[PDB]
């Protein structure tokens, strides 16, 4: 009550919670990128110079 | 990038030619201008029996 509003007690705890979620989301995004079909070029029909149809 | 789903092939295929010819290569029969058919994997036994000229 000296230098802080009343809502800060809730915000501070919520901020710590939000921080943990953001950290977990960061690792998640990292792993999804290194296993995606764009990074590994999976299910991507690479265009050939002569357009050969198997 | 989901797995692609190519369009189904048109009606005309090689499958009917191969099925008819391999069926012709068995089950004997009579040809148009000749006398009798011989199934495959049986005329080969006749070839190794009568043999071919060598040297």
TrEMBL record, chain A:
Residues annotated to bind heme c 1: 40
Spans through the membrane: 14-34
Record-listed heme c 2 binding positions: 54
Residues of the full protein shown: 2 to 55 of 219
Name of the protein described by the UniProt record: Cytochrome c7-like domain-containing protein
Origin species: Chloroflexus aurantiacus (strain ATCC 29366 / DSM 635 / J-10-fl)
TrEMBL record, chain B:
Phylogenetic lineage: Bacteria, Bacillati, Chloroflexota, Chloroflexia, Chloroflexales
Record-given protein name: Uncharacterized protein
